[PDB]
Design a protein around this ligand. Sequence first.
Ligand code: FOT
Ligand code: FOT
Ligand code: ZN
Ligand code: ZN
Ligand code: ZN
Ligand code: ZN
Lengths: 364, 364
Amino acid sequence: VQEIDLGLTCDMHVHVREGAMCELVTPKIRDGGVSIAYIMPNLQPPITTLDRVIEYKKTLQKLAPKTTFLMSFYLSKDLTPDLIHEAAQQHAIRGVKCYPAGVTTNSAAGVDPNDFSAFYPIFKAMQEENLVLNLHGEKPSVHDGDKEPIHVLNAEEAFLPALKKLHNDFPNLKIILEHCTSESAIKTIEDINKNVKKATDVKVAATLTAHHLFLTIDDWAGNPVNFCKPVAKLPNDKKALVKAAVSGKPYFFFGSDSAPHPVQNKANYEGVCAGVYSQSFAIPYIAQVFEEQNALENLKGFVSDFGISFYEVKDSEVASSDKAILFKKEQVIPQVISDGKDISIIPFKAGDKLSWSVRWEPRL
Amino acid sequence: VQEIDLGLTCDMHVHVREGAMCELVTPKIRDGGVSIAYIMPNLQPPITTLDRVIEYKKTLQKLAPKTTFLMSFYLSKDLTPDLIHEAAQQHAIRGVKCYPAGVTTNSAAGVDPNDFSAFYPIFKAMQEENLVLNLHGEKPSVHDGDKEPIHVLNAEEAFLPALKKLHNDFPNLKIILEHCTSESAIKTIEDINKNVKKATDVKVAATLTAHHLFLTIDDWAGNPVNFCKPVAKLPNDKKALVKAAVSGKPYFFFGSDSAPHPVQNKANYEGVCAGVYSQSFAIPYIAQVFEEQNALENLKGFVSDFGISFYEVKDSEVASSDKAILFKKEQVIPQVISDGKDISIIPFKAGDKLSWSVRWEPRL
Ligand SMILES: O=C(O)c1[nH]c(=O)[nH]c(=O)c1F
Ligand SMILES: O=C(O)c1[nH]c(=O)[nH]c(=O)c1F
Ligand SMILES: [Zn+2]
Ligand SMILES: [Zn+2]
Ligand SMILES: [Zn+2]
Ligand SMILES: [Zn+2]
């Protein structure tokens, strides 16, 4: 069977929750073919204190000794530049994640992106310490008022001005538009990186999920299992995301936004939790897309090289030197992912066949 | 206003199912303030025979003696012009309802709207007999190679040409675009109706639901109770729909598309049954919108006059001459609507309070 050495794969947008759910999903990072994971902070309550981010990381390390964990804070008014400096100097975080209030899971304690001025001391501190600003790039929805309507389909586009202003005001701060879903955002990212020759010059980048390379509005209209934020959009939006994923440009790399929810939290007549679970087969899912696009030679950049460069991950910190090897053995995605206890999860593309599997081969 | 005599109210798009669901729902037509109901045929199996439509109507008259029932056939492959003539000749149907295959509930036995040709003999029979052609105006989805993609968001616009072609080929056939959801469809309807002041001259009309005058994509993205076909669209679309509902134009009238489903069929992680249940408070829902638009003087036209005119309902046919009186007593919508057995339904806007109630006054 054909094999591809992906090296030290990284997934820069991971949700692993807490408690039993965290015990179930955290080992799946390695099983899905991911060596390095950027852990998002939207817990109940959000991670805003040094003590809880340190304890949280250790909990993950206990659950997966071979997975490299990059941690983050949740952008909040509780944060202070002093806390940022202290946490950065103790190597306890690599970035801060911004949730606008109301747009997704555990975003109620989030920010109004019609401001982002109140957090400039925070960004100033983050810029000094080389920390990354991760953005959930969606404006809260507005329907009345002569300003024009913001809904789930244009909320990402409506956010692009805020991104451009932040990059302008903090030109040396590393910023990521997480999980791009629209062609407009892909273009905005390319235009921001127009004068860029070295991958190491990228200051604004974007992550792409597995599921936004497959899904359009039709797949989640009627299927909460496929509902997530930002929602999958129109067929042209999908096309633009795939071209970027296979483009080889250093400002687009893999972030799954694997967002596990127990099935009973998706099977609601009301208040369906947003979020798609892709961790268990993260890298194989991406392989399908690069295969169908005849672009397997670019797979390594999208899932390894560009994320390592952008986050400046050194062999000094990786918890295991094992390389993820993709081998072309068909498998079937199970119907559920379960701990054999209270938790059952419906995986992305449940019941479908993947061309590729993934294994771990030692180095040297 | 405190009281408004709405007269002989009309709901020209009603689903009452069969069995216990029907026993629960059919009396709610009257309790919702509706005197006249156009009954849709997408049962299992679809209503495609004279005998079945008679027993259905008879089942409904035993559950609601004071409700006037206009019945319909399901446009299927089993229909024949002779059946159309015979059914019209016995006053057993007032129209035939078209479902594109796969787009909505119990539509698997429906038609491909890219080849309506095979049903033209049916349309000549309907045209001679002055029956109405009700259209669920959505093309089935396609994400294929050459042709432009069709999804739940443009499927109604993608259907407008077929509507125009049908109007051109059968200029005397009364045709309704049921449940309009897009500004593009509103434009197409007015345009078709550009040279019409008499109101008996309208041949193509469109019904507007209760829920589409409130909902946008944001309200059903995470709330299956609000998922329906055609989906609620963008704020601009709602804007056109509300404007048309209150416009006083005779080519737009009320059809609820009240579509009852048991709660367990909305709380799926996949395959959520499309459909919003509005029957229990049909008229109060519409009252809210006309109040908020300072247009209560147009309420009677939208829920009574224009539908009676277009369907040519004569006092010969009405099962009760009782008048619907809207009185401003503010009530609260239950969280559930139940028969006290296996069936529970989440009503539209469950738990909200409505300014208006409705009662029945006899004619004297
Ligand atoms: O995209 C996100 O930010 C997000 N974050 C989450 O914690 N859960 C989600 O389900 C989700 F869609
Ligand atoms: O919109 C329709 O046509 C429709 N008809 C139905 O019978 N049930 C539905 O749930 C529905 F959405
Ligand atoms: Zn997000
Ligand atoms: Zn996320
Ligand atoms: Zn319909
Ligand atoms: Zn219907």
